[PDB]
Design a protein around this ligand. Structure first.
Ligand SMILES: N[C@@H](CCC(=O)N[C@@H](CS)C(=O)NCC(=O)O)C(=O)O
Ligand SMILES: N[C@@H](CCC(=O)N[C@@H](CS)C(=O)NCC(=O)O)C(=O)O
Lengths: 215, 215
């Protein structure tokens, strides 16, 4: 009844895997080869031709952030958003902030030397705003358990770790971002996340390849 | 009880004016001078330092799309989103598509000659996808009356008209985009929109100035 056109490396696909598993929703995972996109992928997502694409009752939902809100509204038990409208607006605000700033991480795949150091310090500033104004002293962005905001920021854990290793730069460090680094460790230790993340060696090999092709 | 830090020209501010007026919410409009931002603006929106900023019960909400969803959740009567989760996901999908593609309109303020013609045809393609896959044969994106999707696309009416006149290019024409052009006329004729839009001559003079400074 639920299908997910995905991948074993895309952080955007993993957001959807986490939300479905948090809801206890049974689904078929269909791994797409992005060099040979399926007929169903192109039919279901003609606008972007990207994964993830959730298909529920034969009807498709593309874009990870749109899919997450659909899952939250369709399976409302064990909520991943707060009930208060102001708190919900803050969650949407931070999710949107991450989506706009995710482009600044692309410079870690292209820049070198004194330019890559500049890109890394700009990423640290992006993360510091998120840490200071978004996370604060909470264990998770969701408070005492993960919510859609933690899910939207999960790419700053093993995916960012792999990018740091592939590029030879440090971004999310305990000395510079103490609370955000503790959060990244706590997020990765949540059993649902621990049991549903790509193998680090494979992810690192993928990131090295992306940096290789993007110079 | 409700304050809006805004402007008399920003299309993003006008999205919020429309949603508040559709809800019958009383508000104070505080027009910001963006060359001399108020103490309250900088305190309420430290992340972007932009307008609009809604302040409700002394608590601020920045980013027009975040504000629109907050207004819809806070004042749920006379809904601006559908009830069905799949239809709500489609509305969010199209709003997101507009937000990502709004950057392609920036080239109409910078490019000239055979390059500006290229930017205009790329904008027509963006609008054609919206017309064919989003609007379809409905009178409005909201069906028989305007919703958050029409509000999010309202900048493609008099704001885009002013940009076309300032740049000397044509984008939203009846021959090329028949349904979207009829929608733009119908949107502007809705009494709530008609009574709450900037004066066209002032808006055109503003767009000419933006094109002048952005070459
Ligand atoms: N904004 C999209 C981004 C998804 C995305 O970039 N997907 C990539 C995989 S990580 C993709 O499908 N790329 C298509 C390709 O490489 O042709 C979302 O959040 O779902
Ligand atoms: N993404 C924001 C965009 C708002 C925006 O760009 N605001 C402009 C006015 S149209 C602004 O405040 N600019 C600040 C400046 O010029 O310093 C939204 O949707 O609210």
């Amino acid at each position: 009844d639920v299908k997910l056109h995905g991948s074993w490396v895309s952080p955007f696909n993993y957001r959807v895997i986490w939300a479905l598993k948090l809801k206890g929703v049974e689904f078929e995972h269909i791994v797409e080869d992005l060099t040979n996109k399926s007929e169903l992928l192109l039919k279901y997502n003609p606008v972007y031709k990207k994964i993830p694409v959730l298909v529920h009752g034969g009807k498709p939902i593309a874009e990870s952030l749109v899919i997450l809100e659909y899952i939250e509204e369709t399976w409302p038990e064990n909520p991943l958003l707060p009930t208060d409208p102001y708190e919900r607006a803050m969650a949407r605000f931070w999710i949107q902030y991450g989506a706009t700033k995710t482009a600044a991480f692309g410079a870690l795949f292209r820049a070198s030397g004194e330019e890559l150091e500049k890109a890394a310090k700009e990423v640290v500033e992006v993360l510091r705003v998120l840490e200071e104004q978004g996370l604060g002293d909470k264990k998770f962005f969701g408070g005492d358990s993960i919510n859609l905001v933690d899910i939207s920021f999960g790419l700053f854990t093993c995916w960012l770790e792999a990018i740091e290793e592939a590029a030879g730069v440090k971004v999310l460090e305990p000395s510079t971002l103490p609370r955000l680094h503790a959060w990244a460790q706590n997020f990765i230790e949540v059993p649902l996340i621990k049991e549903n993340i790509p193998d680090y060696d494979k992810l690192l090999l993928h990131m090295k390849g992306v940096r290789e092709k993007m110079m």
